[PDB]
Write a protein that binds this ligand. Structure first.
Ligand SMILES: [Au+]
Ligand SMILES: [Au+]
Ligand SMILES: [Au+]
Ligand SMILES: [Au+]
Ligand SMILES: [Au+]
Ligand SMILES: [Au+]
Ligand SMILES: [Au+]
Ligand SMILES: [Au+]
Ligand SMILES: [Au+]
Ligand SMILES: [Au+]
Ligand SMILES: [Au+]
Ligand SMILES: [Au+]
Ligand SMILES: [Mg+2]
Ligand SMILES: [Mg+2]
Ligand SMILES: [Mg+2]
Ligand SMILES: [Mg+2]
Ligand SMILES: [Mg+2]
Ligand SMILES: [Mg+2]
Lengths: 171, 171, 171, 171, 171, 171
């Protein structure tokens, strides 16, 4: 390749893997998004909240796909695995799963950054530090906030709790 | 379910399958989209054209997911299969694959409409007739147009052809 | 904690210490700010200059407090020590003390960054690199500039010098 | 001093003390402010409410610092003591501590006014009467209101109570 | 020096060298810029494209000169070497030389970043990561794109190719 | 060449030389520009004044490069020599060097005009008369003015002088 400079094949692989992980999380949030528009769940702000997260994660993937073409790498796509559940059980459960999901995305991204360090790709280091490492910290903190309020409010057994969180926090 | 009326389990299954098919085509077009921003391909309008198609197909899926929740069905998601290639070979080849893809989407949708007919779901009939059956005819005709010009122009061997089509038709 | 990931207790402590250091510098600049509105000093631009620095440093502290809550840490506040003097002696002396102060803030921040490196917190690395390491370089260079002109002009013995610097540079 | 007229050294000392007290309350409210942005508390309006109080109290200090320079006195700053807690326990507890804090600020200010009376400083009397004595009465009444509603609503055991007060009163 | 902190003489030298390298590339692009306004070449968009690159590289140098004065270093300037050719041969050849040039600039900058790492200058690390390491990746990818299209189009023997690239891509 | 008419090879050479001279003066002024943003010099208007002169001289070069391509000549570039000093000593010294520099540029340009006269290039005569001969007279007179005031004010020993000239003339 005529553009490739200082781009280690293992970083290339790392990125391709990370692209799949970001697509997977977009799918998980799309699943949740339409879980909440169910007639027997019907929390439309939860539904809009997770649909926005989903499209946000698709943007994450595209940046990485864009990073692979910028550096000289070759995007190699894999199947996008279906989420662990179609029935996300409750607004609380969906927030806890979202929280657990993003800490794993964070892990993988922390692992990616580390590979880039051992390979002397400062550009890739700066890439993850700039667009991912802090997006994740805010996502994880925000999700943490949401998890905490819904527990303190009494979700999901308190019939009022998820309905109020929907209308007042996510509105 | 308290919303379900005149909604046959086989239509439900049909829809869930169709949702996966629409996600698959969105993925195929995303793959092509980033194929053309490669430094050794670098047809940015082809890349923008297929990225728009991709997001358009994601919208297709969401409507169907929305249709499933409206009728009383239960969205059951499957893995999203990786496309047949990561190297779409040329602007012409990518248009021919896109054309072949959409005729299959069309087939499945024609098959879905037929199931809905034999099951007496006029609502589902009208759904596909309204948002899908003609979107497909226009997609297939448009793709057909593109395929024809690029052949007539001499793609991909004519070095000028794909570059001009990029700048003048897809610009 | 449910948000904490890859956040070493020594980094937590480092941050809590740094928060106090940033509050301390805000206090030092508040002291200077009101030193210059004295009727027997009466350099109102010096006074406005240092009052702006003070509020700027309070902002520094808040970001760090915000960083501690984002990562899962626990803000643990300490007394805010009074400055070394209430009588900052002259506009020159106050600039030299400000310069010496910020090089220490810089030291501590350089030390903090180093801890984060040895602990594999790339997020915290990027945090300090983004909002602190360069703010400090500009502060130190700006203060350096000010120190130099006031010396070259003859502060504080030249009765004209501090009065002109006040009206022409800090105006 | 050439500006000093009718300004008793004990009033000067009183003011310097009061300046420290006003800085202390600003710090207490800053602590609370970031207590509520904790991921395991996450009441963002409580957090904004107390952060505004904090900056309001910093303004209190500055006026007094400004009063000292106007009259001929000499600002003599002391350490700013850390608050009694870093864990403000609940929105209710934080309001009760805020209420108790401001009644003490009020006490000290009432004591200051009294000193000024026995010393024949009508200017200082008018100063406190104009910018402090009523600011305090409104703060104390407002805090009283807040305390009462949160008790009546069932804070902190009622999971709904603090969450609703956050969104509906402090929003 | 009174501003210098944590600034290693070898980093200083590195920067001074890098400043010359950035001036050299500005000169190379100025040469190309006026190569294309030749009456026997006359590709005015190529000429405008390279003249913009040139001024962009002068900006690169100035930032580094600004970085040297900010940190306490001393700008030490060297001769600016004439480019390797005055006759850049063709639009394709000029793009290939530009591509090769920027990968070297990139190399030097990657080497500079590495020096800064071994010297514990995180500020200088962040400087290059922020304003240079990615500017280079985009330049190299963009130049790569251009190189590829002009080859695929048949430059320079195809009389149409450079003329169309001029009017349609660089217009 | 098909555009060349009445264009003597010695004029061509003259122009190529003059182009280098104009690049040299641009470099000298860039050096001065960043000399004054030094933390131990810190005359920001001097710095802006000389940075504007530098870009102005780059424009001079480009016109001559443009003149060479217009007439049929061939731009042949040489190394751009580093200036005589990196330490311009004082605002006065920098103005005196600038003054001496421009009288030499003027000399060379007067010499160029003379060559054009003996060669019967009235176009080149008119070129220099129109864009250079008077730009130089104004530059030299302006620089002369500046030199005179700074001497009369007492530069560089008078600590006030350069600082006031910076803020009041060059502001
Ligand atoms: Au789970
Ligand atoms: Au790295
Ligand atoms: Au195919
Ligand atoms: Au039907
Ligand atoms: Au000192
Ligand atoms: Au790190
Ligand atoms: Au209490
Ligand atoms: Au009184
Ligand atoms: Au070459
Ligand atoms: Au570093
Ligand atoms: Au000289
Ligand atoms: Au002539
Ligand atoms: Mg993500
Ligand atoms: Mg479709
Ligand atoms: Mg600070
Ligand atoms: Mg108060
Ligand atoms: Mg550059
Ligand atoms: Mg000139």
């Amino acid at each position: 390749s005529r553009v490739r400079q200082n781009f280690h094949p293992d970083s290339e692989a790392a990125i391709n893997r990370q692209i799949n992980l970001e697509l997977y999380a977009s799918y998980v949030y799309l699943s949740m998004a339409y879980y909440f528009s169910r007639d027997d769940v019907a929390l439309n702000n939860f539904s809009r909240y997770f649909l926005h997260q989903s499209r946000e994660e698709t943007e994450h993937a595209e940046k990485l796909m864009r990073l692979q073409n910028q550096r000289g790498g070759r995007i190699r796509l894999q199947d996008i695995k279906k989420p662990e559940q179609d029935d996300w059980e409750s607004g609380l459960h969906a927030m806890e799963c979202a929280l657990l999901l993003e800490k794993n995305v964070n892990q993988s991204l922390l692992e990616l950054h580390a590979l880039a360090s051992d390979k002397g790709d400062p550009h890739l280091c700066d890439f993850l530090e700039t667009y991912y490492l802090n997006e994740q910290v805010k996502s994880i903190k925000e999700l943490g906030d949401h998890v905490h309020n819904l527990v303190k409010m009494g979700a999901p057994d308190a019939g009022l709790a998820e309905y109020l969180f929907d209308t007042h926090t996510l509105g």
